[model samples]
Target chain A: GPGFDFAQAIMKKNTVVARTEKGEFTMLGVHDRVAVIPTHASVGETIYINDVETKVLDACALRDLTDTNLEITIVKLDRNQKFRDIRHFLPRYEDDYNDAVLSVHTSKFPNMYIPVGQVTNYGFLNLGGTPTHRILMYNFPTRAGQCGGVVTTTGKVIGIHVGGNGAQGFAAMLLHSYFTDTQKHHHH
Target chain B: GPGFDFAQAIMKKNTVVARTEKGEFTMLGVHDRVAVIPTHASVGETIYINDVETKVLDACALRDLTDTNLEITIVKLDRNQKFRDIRHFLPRYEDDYNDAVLSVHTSKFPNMYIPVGQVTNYGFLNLGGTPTHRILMYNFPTRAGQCGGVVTTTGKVIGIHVGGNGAQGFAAMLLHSYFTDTQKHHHH
Candidate 1:
């Protein structure tokens, strides 16, 4: 443990830029609650991803039971590969970018580098705030022989990447909020 | 990293409790999370486990979807086998034992265990406290095993025998609260 200079050489390594071409990418994971609305007119059941979650269900395995009711078997989208392939099928919640707030944290359980992006400030709109807000998107990739790395957009260092999905891919909105809303709690 | 003493001291030696014509029975690994559920159920929707604090979703692969609504791909169950298998399904939201507090958790999560003999309670109860619970009654040599080691009806040890549908079978349960109060959050 003494000879392994992980902290000095790896985690604390300073840099000015990051890129997907050189940096790692986060495994694509999703909740099974994603719904896939049928693009065609039929009379069975069709699954539609919740507007907030924005995860798209597979088109083949849906039924349109009635005009109002739809039945669907959402796939296990939490797998890295499933996320890698099905992401394009679903749409990203757009309102996420508007009021997105960003934060950088160091000390925490499972110490992580979080990017708490955007939130609708009531001062600007005041009408109960904007409906859309930015969600935390995991974009880090685990490199072989590497655990932690740097994240950047357009070569600008954004945040540090840490940890990977284990057993069941658990999400960390707590970490996100802990970084962004250190002063106040936001309600859904 | 490669130490044999730690594993051998804790595990390799099994204490054979009582042996009879039933076969060699040894008690081991009590508190560990066993791979019991034969099928893996992805999150059908955003499910709050235990409380609102434990948010479980985002295409995450969960281990405990047992009797919950599942997308069965390769398993074929007989009428009798189905009853026996129901013991490992999702926690019922309306079961009398659940106290109407449905959340994502193992049967052990709430101190619930399947008592052997006749499938009385804890097997499968209908949604929302209904008596029309799903029950399985399997018949192909329920007492012994032809492929893997013998299975115990006593419910003492876990049944991870390598059968035709070797998806690492284990026990599971379901609760209704996942539907009523969604999202993983902490109880203040």
Candidate 2:
């Protein structure tokens, strides 16, 4: 709670580079029209993604992916004519970091990656000690535009890059959780 | 150290698997009769290595490789007949972890490594914050016998796996200081 306040942290944390995006950003593309990001854009805010978010806002996770706000969230996008353009850098979120993963976050744009380290700890402290934090810390450092999507060499979205001490993040499964949770939160 | 103490922590913290070797041992064979282990073997001890140590003692670094006692140190050895083997896993202490490195600590033995993660953080918090702790964290979890030498693929020692929050260690350059300081301490 002390290090990075989740509520305030999301602004520059979530899939940034968006609706007034500041820090680096990445529109983590998935199957549905819904996209994933690692920032804190207010729900109902207009933004951009694989298919520019002319549609709607997002749904967030439990907060504090470690000791920071950086969360894995989902944004519903517009069904524009060029919606499913082949330029989409589609990816996934799995359970492990067995494969070598790099930061899908960079200045060059979509899918461009920089060699960041791997998942340092499964759970924040030891291997799964503090699950309440919902953290997934990696072994790399991030820069201005280096905070976005963390994907495997195969382009599988394993974790989302949200800036923290050790380039912290929200696991891809959490993105799935955000997707599933967000949809449910939307209906209710 | 709320997580791991330096004193009793050193038993399993320092260059172990010696005197009375246990928990997957490796005689991190360095120059001189000195060998490095990742256990808490008390100073003025005897152990085996690239050269069997009818040896002497050791010099330690600060505490906690990251909230733990896993420290990088050096031990003075005894010059015996089985001295100077050609199979020593010669390594160096560098300031960075740029090259792909692996764990030099394994059951198969000295220099035989199992792939672990990389230097996750330069310092414990953020990058190089608490330099007093003398920590060098990596991105992999270690096993019972898999915590010792952390060297580059080419056999350059960068860190020593003691045990902590995230597979923590003492940088090899610290070992260099351990050697130089230990000598000075010895003379005094």
Candidate 3:
């Protein structure tokens, strides 16, 4: 109301990254996950993303007119812990990390943040000879319906976009361990 | 993995009740309104439906087809210090002082012994009057798209549920409160 005319702004629609309370920044993205962990849970997960890495979220952080109707808030990124350089070793170095970054950067609905957990052995084989971490990934019986729904603080989502029956798909913000050192630090 | 063909069972849908750890009961319904209270700061409310005045849950509790797909059980009603007869007299009546067989029977979702304070409102009044004595109703925000929820021993629904647009909409159960002077004396 003060500095910007929200309706008149000519920029195209995109998911916005706004602040929570302190320096904590958050972006709402939709993914396979129907449950959302409240942003305040960041108390335990603040990490650093580099200055350049800071802008990496810019692409995914785009916001527009529709988001104003939601009850969720994307926490502002705050700097906390140093970025863990886990990417130093990836099975398919070129494909793994690059694919992760590209997934977020090039998404049409850029709100859901997908975590990189290798599920299939084929994916492992795709990683080649590099040492990759294998973690368990499971989709619940009702997992099919979660899309762009607000993941609540208790890790429970109250609603999802569901492509609106191919019209309004689900939306969710991805929050996992893939941010840069600077980006990680900002979340703290 | 087991003989329970969840998919096939869905086709032959039926309603049922299921119990959780600590002997609490919950029913599976098609559509229900679960409560949502801000927990970080304020103390949430619980309802106590007394014997003096009783009201049954809505018929929708028995209507949804998808709700009958899962297992079901009968929730045992428990009476504690929180509930009392809805009488105008002070220090009204308790299990010991009277033997009128005061029981809070949960009928709508049979085979599902809905627990106390889980899905039902004790004595909610959207108008001016409040419930006699609010013990603390369980919080289950299903209307907001919560699913596969539960009630904690402390009487809170802090569990995981399938969310998103594609999720099957199942209603929650309502637990009845009965007069239990026996349980009280056993504790004393």
The top-ranked prediction according to TM-score is: 2
Candidate 1 lDDT over B1-188, as tens digits, reads: 11112212222221112122332222122111111221222222322222222222223222224534221111111111111222322333422221111011121111101111221133442322323222221212212121112122321222222222221111222222222324676522
lDDT, candidate 2, A1-188, per-residue tens: 01111111222222334543443365544444555665443444666543345656444433453454435565665654322321223323334444334434333332222333455435433212323334465555443444455444342345555554434443433433443423233432
Q: Is candidate 1 or candidate 3 better by TM-score?
A: 3
lDDT of 2 by residue, B1-188 (tens): 01111111122222334434544444454544555654343444555543345656545433553554434445566654332322223333434554334434332332222233355435433222333344566555443444555444343345555554434433423344443423234432
Q: Model 3, residue B34: what's the lDDT? A: 21
Residue A170 Cα positional deviation in candidate 2, in Å, after optimal superposition: 7.1
Chain B TM-score per candidate, please: 0.19, 0.55, 0.17
Clashes of 1: 64
CA lDDT, every model vs. true structure:
0.22, 0.42, 0.21
What's model 2's TM-score? 0.35
Between candidates 2 and 3, name the one with more favorable lDDT.
2
Q: Where does candidate 3 chain B have its weakest 10-residue lDDT segment?
A: B96-105
Question: What DockQ would candidate 3 receive versus the native complex?
Answer: 0.01
Interface RMSD of each: 18.9, 15.9, 22.4
Candidate 2 local Cα displacement, residue A87, angstroms: 18
List TM-score per model, in order. 0.15, 0.35, 0.23
